[model samples]
Target: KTNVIALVLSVDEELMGFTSQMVFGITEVLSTTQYHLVVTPHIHAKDSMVPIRYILETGSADGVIISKIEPNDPRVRFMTERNMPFVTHGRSDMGIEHAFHDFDNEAYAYEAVERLAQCGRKRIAVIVPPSRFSFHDHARKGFNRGIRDFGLTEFPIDAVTIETPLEKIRDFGQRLMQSSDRPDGIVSISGSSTIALVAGFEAAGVKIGEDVDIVSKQSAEFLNWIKPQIHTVNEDIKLAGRELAKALLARINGEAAETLQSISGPVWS
Candidate 1:
């Protein structure tokens, strides 16, 4: 083994901010250790296992950290079967659990809904990531549960996602705001999408904080300055990075997978 830690990160417009901070956080912890960090970039929607396969075949990395986990990730299974040390930035649903560090996406969505409900919004909507990712299920569950518990009406949204193009998302936001049946409160899953949606709302001549309210999950600190109407919950990307690195290190030392798992809570702001 090369005493190397490989990070298989997905690079997209929506994920770049989180990716940068995560890389920084990981390097901060690894700088004091014997291991060095190597980033293997994966374009969105491509094969997630390409980097891991390369590392395994070349014997270049001692351990790996991967993000954008699927419910049944092939990389996790392949690595687990080979007894390779690895940690996921998000969780998986396979019966064979492994080391991971994740934010509580479900709890974040629940709290977001509760906050909007308390703001006296009777109808609510949410912008979710694509269903391919495991976190989408978690967020959907929490959103549905909150809607039922709070006695709020669900505003169905199927046109946009975190992966949608910025211009299209903006158009959706503008159209939604102009419609007679627009939701008063919206839950946005990503800061970038929130920015686009807000811009769309503005172009439609909709005054934020007066016409609607939005609560978004932010990996960085800049979302707050976008608009006073936008509320946010911190996902703590750097903390996630540090935790993922620590977990992978522990895994390499033969730590139990379940023991190395961690989930950070939402920090509302």
Candidate 2:
């Protein structure tokens, strides 16, 4: 039970639906592997690696699993230099790679934009992670690439940080939906955010599938209740947990986790 102590970021359950399921998932993976995964909810989600690093130095937990990956993750660098075992749920462009699992955010965003554009919806908008987050850069890149490649006019991109309060997200949704150039097609990068967007749209008197269409990268399958036309691309965080488990366990046992990657729950209407 004390072979390797692991961590999962439970800063907020609904912060990202992916994180919510992933906590359970990694627990399942590590449990099945006969290891203990300590539930250390991040006190300051913005302050990464502090707790994990403390655990390592203190020798409470030797191994770590992490998400909310950054572009140039100094944390990953530290662990890698120490030859410590770690696994990331998303890839980092930070130049040092140990092991990671990632969804095709760029491709997903590009395709989502393409779909909206092909359907002849201008004033397209996207709600993505804050600029500081690593994944934000990727999502923005893909979305922008789609905009330029499709010959569509610029999409009014907005920041939707994981730290943003749910109420604020709802308000942002309302303002975006009710704006003068309200998007006929919008991409809510976070799958769970569709809930906030739906509420905002309805509160602001915009109708889904009628006033607008939406596409998202979501893990919570139930968001379909808002509108079937409100489509989501699949991102199985549970599988992500399982995959990270594969990598970290390999790292624990002195091997690599195959550097695996997979994407898509498919773009479905």
Candidate 3:
């Protein structure tokens, strides 16, 4: 183990806001310490394991921070078995004890649905992350739970997600707005997808706040400026980064992974 910490991240364009804030948070902590932070961006999920393997093979870092965690992340298992110190930005349900800093996506999704119901929206819809990520299951379960508890109908869409290209999501949004069964309320997990969908709705001549109300989880603060009709739930990516760094450092120092784990609550505005 060297005096460096590695961050294995996905440098997807849609997530730049989330990525930058977390990087800022991580840097804020590491800058005051002897350890240096190094980022390795892996653009595709297939390539996500490459850097981790490189780190394992080279013994380049004292600890690692990994995001976009899966339900059974091989990388996590790999690191765990090798006794490499690491912390995840999302939780894993595989029963392996490891340090992590995660946003409570389940609570955010439920709160979003509840707020939309309060807005008198009858038919609710959701745009969530890909099914592979660990948080996806949490968010989906929460959304489904809200739908059942609120006695609301779901406006289902299987064509696009947060990872889908913005143009495609925009097109889908236009088509969705034109549908006879269009929803009155929508819950979006990502801010960028929310922007694309809103743009499409406006392009289709639908006025937000009047035609539809949207509640989205935002890593950045520009959602209100986009439209006052939009409701936002804040995910503190900067805090996540800082927490992840601290957790990894503690893990490297032989602290119990269970003690190093933390989950942040949703901040609604």
Overall lDDT per candidate, in order of appearance: 0.88, 0.72, 0.90
Q: Which candidate is the best by lDDT?
A: 3
> Each model's TM-score, in the order given?
0.96, 0.89, 0.98
Pick by TM-score: 1 or 3, better one? 3
Candidate 2 local Cα displacement, residue 88, angstroms: 0.7
Task: Give the local distance difference test score of model 3.
Answer: 0.90
Q: Candidate 2: global Cα-lDDT?
A: 0.72
lDDT of 3 by residue, 98-181 (tens): 999999989988988899999999899899889999989999989999998998989898998889999899999998899787
- Name the regions of candidate 3 deviating beyond 4 angstroms: none
Pick out the ten consecutive residues of candidate 3 with the lowest summed lDDT: 11-20
lDDT per residue as tens, model 1, 94-178 = 8978999888889989998999999998799999989988899989989998998999998989999988988899999998889
Model 1 ranges off by over 4 Å:
none
**Candidate 3 RMSD computed on C-alpha atoms after optimal superposition onto the true structure:** 1.0
| Superior by TM-score: candidate 1 or candidate 2 | 1
Q: After superposition, how far is residue 245 of candidate 3 from its true place, in Å?
A: 0.6
Task: Mark the 10 consecutive residues where model 1 has the least summed lDDT.
Answer: 10-19
Off by over 4 Å in 2: 13-17, 158-162, 257-269
